[PDB]
């Protein structure tokens, strides 16, 4: 009726839309993360399938330089490329919906001392505080060794310098889960909360 | 409760049904593997044992006329056909899943310069390279001769040529298994990622 | 309080209004789009289902006669029909949600040459350019065969002409993706930004 | 925002909600098809274990009056009674999930003019025409002896006459499938649509 | 536009907000219901395989001051500790979703005066009456000894009472199956409405 009485509307539809700008976010968040624990286990099963006849799993190769489309076509030893050309998964399930990057894949040893990668690690970079700390809770009991580094979108810190070493001694700040001796940590409220520090996080899963 | 959320919402459902349409795709492609894999080796198996007597294969006749109806009653020297009659095979296990066609059987040489068919080799046409792929992977190193060709569905270009030379040398791109020296070949995923390179592929299976 | 004071909140009133106008358009479009993914899905695996017994799929028939009533009882060969009589969908998934038709089903050829319907395409009709890039981004990189025209609303030109040839060299303008060499391009935004280019629009999906 | 808004966005609520009904009903429609072919056949295999020492099968007696609790203590031959007390079937796999009624079981005649039951016959009741046509394309090639007749729910029209012709002449309307000449029809789309033409069907499945 | 429009359009909002309450809360009981029937069969099969040398079943220890980590290393005889070591089962497998204890597991006696557990009991601790009505009509009918009591979270009255006895007579209130005489009833709706009468209740299930 009156300009007092719509200024009064407009704030609160501003507020109503600032409440819809939270939840929009929350939601990709959640989709993200249920995707990514999705995608994670189809390349952990692929994987085991794939590469069963060579008794060892490939180095690391930097996935950062494929297009949506390179990815069909590229014979340069990268996993995940070699993983969508066998048709075990398509691009879009391949690429990382939060940083944007295609999976890093790279070998992973389970021994002391190994040269030979007997496992596999695949890491998950440009996660926030809260999608890491989603992911974990959702999906870090089900992996053998877990760890938390600070690897930014289009960097794969974790994999780009060797082998992934399962039997690392954890420490519940950066590796949570791992073959060590009391390595088999349960991530409860309080483990979670301990971890995952940084505004720009990754997460390193691995499996034998 | 807005449109503007409402309009989120459908966006999200959206990309919630293309990735079904995805796994609804990947689950029909492995069910007709698998279902691929079963009927060929239980046409191994019914050919070994109905043609003992003979000492020798039947030439290919070519089953593309055949209907769900006229395989059970022809009687022109189809060898699925007379697998059919003879109860060692029903019509839908008959049927390549993939090409809808009745599964291509034709006759096959175990020595250079012989005249008799004393093997036998079957052909599935029509095959995506994903499917190609998963084929050879599942099942290849169970073959003597394995061969990939181009053959389209309602083609059978491999068979239709003559009887095939088990004894061919392999090149790892055409011919990747067969009975010539060194043609002893263990697929893996480096060579399986250097065949079935078009995007319709045939694969030719020959035993003795 | 005074009448300029009302003549400025009327005006505002207005401003609002007009706005729910396009939230309202924009959430339909959504709501349709999401629709014909589902719908598209669900047409695509009830035809696998329904003609693999038949080796081949039915050519096409035009729907553009049917009613809501006469889809359930028609016997003169239309795909769609066929499919709501076994059970497969009801009507209102069977019918566009944007142009009003019944979806369009016709035959597809997968290799060159051929005369056998191997595999089905679908038409989706009466697109506006915001509808048509909102599928392809939605689901274009999902379908083995994506083609792009300008069938209106009450046509199906691209079924009309015969049946759909999946193995058409792509061109980023009509055809997209395809079986052809080179065919199976990613849909980013440039590509999708160089299609729909007209404001009635209609996409072709076809599938083996 | 304002009231049109909401009165749009609980519209789009209303025809979500509409479309969630029609999937659960098939989705319920789909589940209850699967149990019965998975019954039948658990059905099927029981009687030709249980009955082989009496070289013959028993008489129709209707088990519409059995109870969740009398049909593990009914002792006046019945043959879906007498299969779960044997512990082949539970109560639950014995009853038709779209009726409601326990499974009917009859003698069957394998030859012309014979009064000894050398084969068995089931029926299932108050199937609607998706179901009947699911059904059908789903297992009715699996079976020697196959029609289609209209029992409603409670009703065993087809067993309640009588021993089960299996020599009946196929007409493809209501005996599709038998042990005549020319009987062994397989079950296309289009024969399957030339079928089950009521709201309520049944279907006769005979076996040897 | 107005205030009391606003006023109006928030109540609508908050009435949708409250439905949405009712919904979550429903799902939550949905999936740990189901979570709940999957793992008690799990439960069942591992107790099957994993004492058969023994002879016997293992003797109720309270499980209730196991934690995430205990579990896996704790060695006092705790059965559903053993089966988690045994890799039969998760940590997560062996919680109770409900009630958040660790499912207890007893031994149970199968005839009158024995003193030796021939089977096992398991209880499933502070279901609400919801929950008890939906496992009883979701899993009753398939175990042999079904009992309902009143043992709220952290407490397994059932169990703690000494070995269950398995031939105890139905009653359609607390012990609604066992393997006396008349106690294989079946749970229909108006005997699943005769139980589960508190708003805290267990369920006690027992098989050889």
Same mark, same amino acid.
């Given at each position: 009726m009156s300009l007092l009485e719509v200024i009064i509307v407009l704030g609160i539809i501003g507020t109503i839309a600032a409440g819809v700008v939270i939840l929009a976010q929350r939601a990709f968040d959640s989709r993200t993360v249920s995707e990514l624990v999705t995608n994670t286990n189809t390349i952990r099963v692929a994987m085991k399938d794939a590469y069963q006849r060579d008794g060892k799993y490939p180095d690391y190769q930097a996935p #950062?330089? #494929?297009?949506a489309d390179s990815i069909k076509t $590229?014979?340069?030893?990268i996993a995940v490329a070699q993983l969508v050309q066998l048709g075990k998964l398509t691009p879009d399930e391949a !690429?990382? %919906?939060?940083?944007?990057d295609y999976i890093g894949i790279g070998g992973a040893i389970? @021994? =002391? %001392? =190994?040269?030979?990668?007997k496992g596999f690690a695949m890491e998950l970079n440009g996660l926030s505080q809260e999608q890491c700390r989603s992911i974990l809770g959702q999906v870090? $009991?089900?992996?053998?060794y877990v760890a938390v580094g600070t690897s930014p @979108? %289009?960097?794969?810190d974790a994999l780009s310098a060797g &082998?992934?070493?399962?039997l690392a001694a954890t420490d519940?700040?950066?590796? #949570? !889960? =791992?073959? &060590?001796?009391? %390595?088999?940590?349960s991530l409860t409220a309080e483990k979670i909360l301990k971890?995952?520090? &940084?505004t720009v996080n990754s997460i390193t899963l691995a499996s034998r």
């Open positions: #950062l330089s #494929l297009t $590229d014979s340069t030893g !690429r990382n %919906g939060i940083s944007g389970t @021994s =002391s %001392g =190994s040269t030979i990668n870090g $009991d089900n992996w053998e @979108s %289009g960097s794969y &082998a992934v070493n399962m519940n700040t950066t590796i #949570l !889960r =791992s073959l &060590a001796a009391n %390595g088999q940590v971890t995952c520090t &940084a």
